[PDB]
Amino acid sequence: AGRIASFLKNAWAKEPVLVASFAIGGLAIILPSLSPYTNYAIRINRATPYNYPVPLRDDGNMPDVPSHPQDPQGPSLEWLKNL
Amino acid sequence: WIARTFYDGPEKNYEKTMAILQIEAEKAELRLKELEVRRLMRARGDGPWYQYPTIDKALIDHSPKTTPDN
Ligand SMILES: CCCCCCCCCCCCCCCCC[C@@H](O)O[C@H](CO[C@H](O)CCCCCCCCCCCCCCC)COP(=O)(O)OCC[N+](C)(C)C
Ligand SMILES: CCCCCCCC/C=C\CCCCCCCC(=O)O[C@H](COC(=O)CCCCCCC/C=C/CCCCCCCC)COP(=O)(O)OCCN
Numbered sequence: 001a002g003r004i005a006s007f008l009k010n011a012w013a014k015e016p017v018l019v020a021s022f023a024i025g026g027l028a029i030i031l032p033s034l035s036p037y038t039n040y041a042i043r044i045n046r047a048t049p050y051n052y053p054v055p056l057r058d059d060g061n062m063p064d065v066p067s068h069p070q071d072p073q074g075p076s077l078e079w080l081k082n083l
Numbered sequence: 084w085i086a087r088t089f090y091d092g093p094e095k096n097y098e099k100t101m102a103i104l105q106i107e108a109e110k111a112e113l114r115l116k117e118l119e120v121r122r123l124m125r126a127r128g129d130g131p132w133y134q135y136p137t138i139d140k141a142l143i144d145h146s147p148k149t150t151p152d153n
Contacts, residue, residue, distance in 0.1 A: 054147040 040083070047077060 011019050032038055056065060066073035122131035 020091045051147075 044080065047075075047080060 008019075056062065058067070059064075064073055120130075121132070124132040128134075
């Protein structure tokens with residue numbers, strides 16, 4: 001552990017730019033896998049409607065599918081508003 | 084004595100020749116049949132041979148496409 005600490009201390013002097021570069025790059029590599037908001041970003045990307053939502057033909061066997069936009073069935077965006 | 088200790092009878096060679104001739108005739112017939120079958124398969128394309136690939140239909144996407152007319 002002493003050699004690594006000595007190397008880090010000697011690099012922080014006379015080479016701070018490279019130390020900052022490697023630190024920032026490593027943090028950018030590591031942090032996204034540990035953050036809990038990346039799932040939120042994925043969900044936000046999912047909830048952006050670029051296309052028309054084509055309706056499905058009702059056969060009396062789709063209780064989860066709403067018949068009107070105001071019906072309580074279907075995905076909700078209350079979580080997005082609370083963000 | 085020479086015939087007894089060095090050679091066999093005529094029937095051995097006779098029947099060995101019969102077997103050899105049968106094998107060779109069968110092989111010749113098979114070769115001709117194989118050539119004809121190859122010609123037919125290459126001309127028609129309806130056999131297991133000479134099958135050239137076409138696009139796999141599992142690659143097609145069957146979904147609404149932001150436009151009603153595909
Ligand atoms: C009074 C006598 C007058 C006649 C003299 C005759 C002289 C005979 C010598 C000529 C030999 C002819 C060559 C034969 C070799 C091929 C035949 C071969 O097929 O026979 C084999 C037998 O091989 C013989 O033993 C080969 C003999 C060769 C040796 C010659 C003797 C003298 C050579 C000198 C050797 C060195 C001398 C030492 C010096 C220091 C068995 O084969 P096989 O597939 O089962 O036959 C099937 C038929 N069955 C059912 C009857 C068995
Ligand atoms: C793992 C992450 C990787 C992704 C991030 C990378 C981002 C971009 C950085 C890479 C760019 C290219 C770097 C090229 C490296 C060349 C090194 C080199 O040869 O330089 C030496 C000098 O530098 C060295 O001594 C070699 C490297 C020294 C170590 C650098 C940092 C190593 C790691 C330190 C940081 C570790 C993590 C930080 C955590 C801190 C807490 C957050 C020679 O320099 P000269 O021009 O010849 O001048 C010398 C005469 N005056």
